[PDB]
Amino acid sequence: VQWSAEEKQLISGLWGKVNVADCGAEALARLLIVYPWTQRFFASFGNLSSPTAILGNPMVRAHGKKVLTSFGDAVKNLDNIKNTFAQLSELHCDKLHVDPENFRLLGDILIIVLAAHFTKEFTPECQAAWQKLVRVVAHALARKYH
Amino acid sequence: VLSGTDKTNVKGIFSKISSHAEEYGAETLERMFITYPQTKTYFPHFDLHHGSAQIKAHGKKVANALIEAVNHIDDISGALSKLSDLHAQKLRVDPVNFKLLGQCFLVVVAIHHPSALTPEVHASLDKFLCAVGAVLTAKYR
Numbered sequence A: 001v002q003w004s005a006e007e008k009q010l011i012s013g014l015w016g017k018v019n020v021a022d023c024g025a026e027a028l029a030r031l032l033i034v035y036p037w038t039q040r041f042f043a044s045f046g047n048l049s050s051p052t053a054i055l056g057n058p059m060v061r062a063h064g065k066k067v068l069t070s071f072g073d074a075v076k077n078l079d080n081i082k083n084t085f086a087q088l089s090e091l092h093c094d095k096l097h098v099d100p101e102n103f104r105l106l107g108d109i110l111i112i113v114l115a116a117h118f119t120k121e122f123t124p125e126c127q128a129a130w131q132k133l134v135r136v137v138a139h140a141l142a143r144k145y146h
Numbered sequence B: 001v002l003s004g005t006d007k008t009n010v011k012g013i014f015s016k017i018s019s020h021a022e023e024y025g026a027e028t029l030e031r032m033f034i035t036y037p038q039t040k041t042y043f044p045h046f047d048l049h050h051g052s053a054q055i056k057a058h059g060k061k062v063a064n065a066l067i068e069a070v071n072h073i074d075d076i077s078g079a080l081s082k083l084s085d086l087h088a089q090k091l092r093v094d095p096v097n098f099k100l101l102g103q104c105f106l107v108v109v110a111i112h113h114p115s116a117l118t119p120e121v122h123a124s125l126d127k128f129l130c131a132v133g134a135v136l137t138a139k140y141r
Ligand code: HEM
Pocket: A038, A041, A042, A066, A067, A068, A070, A071, A088, A091, A092, A096, A098, A102, A103, A104, A106, A107, A138, A141
């Protein structure tokens, strides 16, 4: 992965302004709601029985926080993803048994969340970088199936 | 398919378009050119320079069908089906892009109608686009 100069300055040019918890609780909240089946992995989280029930659960919300917090670790070292995500590609593969197709959904949902917030600031170039991001992380997440 | 909740939301959100059909489909097909370049391959005859006269005209084409559809939400097929023989028989759009475009559209909306694209409107809106794409490709099945 060859990172360009304006591709970094942007990633982090946006990150700095990110609400990890707020953005954090949505994407995950939008995921559980958006694609229902993914609620299979979070049953221990308790109530996920209604759109409402979900946007209110403090677990999902809590965890939502360390998810896009981890993407931050993705941003801060845009060169060592396959590593900072080696440990976490095991859990998702040998323990939770989550289909790769679902690391990509969450990524397409991070971007819908990022833009909703930053409205016009999230320029196409902006988007290009950040879709290239979720595609990488996403990738580094599955390397442990291969 | 789409639900009582569903239909009413796609509609409620297609009301707050608005007449913006033009720029919206337009900004959506552009975004889809940069974010996803591989998608340019289908438009060799097309000029793809920001604000290219053409992308303009095709964008109000693409936009006017999504609406068209929204109106007859209860029988989509015969509504876009005609766009079926085009995409499938002639164009041979890789059933994967239909997702990319749907993503850029649901991005455009989310930039202008933030408070209105809530969790539940995100969903339905995605339900809708999925039959829309499920219809234009039918000729595959
Ligand atoms: C693709 C983006 C993803 C990111 C950035 C991510 C990140 C993380 C991280 C850092 C952990 C550490 C576990 C912990 O903090 O206790 C974790 C665990 C976990 N992940 Fe994800 N993961 C992703 C994809 C997924 C997907 C697709 C699913 C299933 C739909 C999933 C379900 C879970 C669950 C259920 C846990 C542990 C929950 C618990 O035991 O309390 N993750 N994830």
